[PDB]
Structures are given as C-alpha cells and as structure tokens.
C-alpha cells in the first residue's frame, strides 16, 4: 500500500495473507468470507505469461495477522488448502477480466477478536454504494513505494472513480467486471495498492446496517500511485452468482 497508514489492531479481521511455503514469502492478499472459504484474485494463483501456477500444497493461508513477517503466536491461525477454484472465464490472456478465485480450507478456522468474516454484497448493496466519489478501503502488506516493505498491515481509503475516467486512464480494455478507485491529480490526496496487495479486499461500511462489505478485490494497476492512473478491482457483486455456485456445490 502506497501512502496509507498502519492498521489498528483488529481493524480488518477478514484480512488473509497468502504465504508461499518455499521460498517463504508474501504471495498476495485475500479475505475471509466464512469459516472455511477464502476469496482472492485468480492471477495471484494462475498467471501463465509468467509461469505462475500454484497448487494447494504450495501455499498456506495466514489469518488474524498484523505484523507482516513475524509469527504471531496465540493470535494468527495458519490454515492448509483443501482446494482452489478459479473462475472458468478468468481472462489471463488479455485484461484479467473476472480476476477471482476461491480457496476452501482443510479445516474451519476459529473466529476470534482478530479473525472474522466480511460480508459479500447483494444487488442493492452494490447499487447503493458503488458510486463515483464514494470511498472504500484497501488493505495489505504490499510494497510502500513503486520502486520498501511495511512492518504491519497498511490501510488506505480511496474514492470510486467514474467509469469514463477509468477507461480514459488506460490502454487496457475495461469490462463491467472491473471498477477503478483512487484520487485524481487535481484532488491532491494520494494512495494506491502496490505489489503484494493483489487479491486483498476493497471494503465499504454500509451506512444502512453498519456492516462491512467486500465490494472489490485488488486486481491490477499500471505502477503504484502514479498521477492519472487508478487501481482496478474485481467487481465482487457481478461475480457473486459464481461464488454462490461454487460454495453451494462444494460446501
């Protein structure tokens, strides 16, 4: 996260770290959506152009974390993966359309002050909150600058951007399964996701029911916190039929 701040303790209890077993390193972010299901970006797990193709046994899910590198004894919980499910129409060839994946844990994780699931939006949730100028929150242990790494989880709040502005900022083909967020140069304020943050959540707190909803997944950006560029997020509500289908069929 560039131009963010240290998270408070228990501020994002759905935050998940995807951790590579060897070498031991941060792979991506992710989020907890139930006691057995974790949501992330498909490209964190599968990206053929760079010969990225993880299997269940290659990584671990670390939940309840705050410090990036420390083993947080008695606080974090480390979980093994039973199965990975990538969206069947994930477009890794072109623009990362439908950049979403689920992973089922071998065993249910116990909820605590530090570990708790985020809500997923329904149609009216999305219609009411996914509006230009409304702010969401992005969190992660990614880099602090495009060109180092944080001691603890970082947080930044960023406004949703108008669709024509998103489209005009990039040469990538943008689809309805994406939305962009970030400040414009004239707005002065800064902030963005960066390397290591992909797969993590873009959340919003409904003013109607005072619950946190995961509206986006950190998907891609052209550099980090560049003027005139914006971060792109998977639109979780638009892919929720797929999410439900997978959880309903595989538990």
């Amino acid at each position: 996260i560039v131009e963010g701040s240290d998270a408070e303790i228990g501020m994002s209890p759905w935050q998940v770290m995807l951790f590579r077993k060897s070498p031991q390193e941060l792979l991506c972010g992710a989020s907890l959506i139930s006691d057995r299901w974790v949501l992330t970006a498909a490209h964190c797990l599968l990206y053929p152009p760079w010969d990225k193709n993880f299997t269940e046994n290659d990584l671990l899910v670390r939940i309840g974390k705050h410090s990036r590198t420390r083993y947080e004894r008695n606080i974090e919980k480390i979980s093994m993966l039973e199965k990975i499910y990538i969206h069947p129409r994930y477009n890794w060839r072109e623009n990362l359309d439908r950049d979403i994946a689920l992973m089922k844990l071998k065993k249910p994780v116990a909820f605590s002050d530090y570990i708790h699931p985020v809500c997923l939006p329904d149609r009216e949730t999305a219609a009411s909150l996914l509006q230009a100028g409304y702010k969401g929150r992005v969190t992660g242990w990614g880099n602090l600058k495009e060109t180092g790494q944080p001691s603890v989880l970082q947080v930044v709040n960023l406004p949703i951007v108008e669709r024509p502005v998103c489209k005009d900022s990039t040469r990538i083909r943008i689809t309805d399964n994406m939305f962009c967020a970030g400040y414009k140069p004239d707005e002065g304020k800064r902030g963005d996701a960066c390397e290591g943050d992909s797969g993590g959540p873009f959340v919003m707190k409904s003013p109607f029911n005072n619950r946190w909803y995961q509206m986006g997944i950190v998907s891609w950006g052209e550099g980090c916190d560049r003027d005139g560029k914006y971060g792109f997020y998977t639109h979780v509500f638009r892919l929720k039929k797929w999410i439900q289908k997978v959880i309903d069929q595989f538990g």
Binding site: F19, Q24, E25, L60, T69, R70, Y71, I78, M80, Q149
Partner: peptide, 10 residues
C-alpha cells in the same frame, strides 16, 4: 525476512 513458523504447518 519472514520469521520461521511452527513445523506442524509445513
């Protein structure tokens, strides 16, 4: 850079 984690998880 990452602290060693309990062997049980690997």
């Amino acid at each position: 850079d990452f602290e060693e984690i309990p062997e049980e998880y690997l």
